[PDB]
Amino acid sequence: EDNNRIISRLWRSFRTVKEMAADRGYFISQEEMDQSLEEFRSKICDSMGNPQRKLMSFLANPTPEALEKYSDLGTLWVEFCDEPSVGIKTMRNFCLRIQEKNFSTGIFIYQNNITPSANKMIPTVSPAIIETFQESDLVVNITHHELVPKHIRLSDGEKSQLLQRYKLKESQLPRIQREDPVARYLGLKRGQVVKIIRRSETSGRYASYRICL
Template sequence: MASGLVTDDAGVGRLVRIRSTVMHMLRDRGYLVVEHELAMTRRDFERKYGESFHREDLLINKCKKNDPNDQIYVFFPNDEKVGMKHIKKYVEMMNAEKVSRAVVVVQQNLTPFAKSFLQELEPKIHLEVFQDAEMLINIKEHVLVPEHQVLTNDEKKTLLERYTLKETQLPRIQITDPIARYYGLKRGQVVKIIRPSETAGRYVTYRYVV
């Protein structure tokens, strides 16, 4: 699949599932995703992109529900190996559109040089990298994954004041945790975790992102 042209049945099926996970992830992060995008079937997908297409055709651009200027891109590189030339091209596009955040869905992984370049771009440009294999299944829908809610700065402040806590006294969640990556969490944020409880109905805990 070096050319990025997807023609085989299995390849199309994989990308239908991957795109679905991406759309649900964007909605869960607060981006404006309409219902028919979430419910897109294989037939809908082929009607939109054709029976053969390039991965790059799946490009997604969304804005936050409450802020049209807060946008994100999702890129699907054609090439199996993604290096500096790909990242530079995406950064140019993002700068031109004044977009500072993007997700890159790769077939394998980034080259070491590309990984280093991503770190140099922070904090002005934030690119998150997911592999195809990570996006085939939506981890949020797993039965063992409880509900997560990201607190706003005001909600975080209220929580800490109510319990007279410093944020560092809260239990921690690593920024590399799969669920933290799904929500695109940043260091310093606090996430509310809601688990079902046989006695209380639900059990709430909070985690500080490190």
């Protein structure tokens, strides 16, 4: 029934976010990503099968390879909002928990929508960084679609080497919007540069860079 599909969608979103975190550079146990639907049900779904969003928020930490590649990859915390709508109190308690926990990065997932007034204070949780996603948005991982090539973020050294190579200025590069679905998926920020290797019909493989904003 509707319960079945609701649980299915929630699990799909969970897998999406797990793969998102993994690709971002953080480690997740192999058993986690392949976590099947029914084991997840048992873990989260209660007797009445209703979702337990609090029961699935978890924490991750960078892998050593990413950690040495990106020195800024700090601890990451994901959390699912129980409230259908997110208000000032909700973000306030969440920010307090993040701050007292000293989490470099935090991800917030809601159900319906967030009031703009609460959204206003989001950038005032420095030096921590907070990002939000809607569950519907994470039902399907975009990066698995054909048309989207593979984006790879770059270290600062790589970016400096690139600018040296093309003798460019920072602005002269092609630009990608900060809220570009892939950019949020990768947790991009200002001044970061991604690398795209694109299927080409005249060369076969074309390597294109894009700077964010």
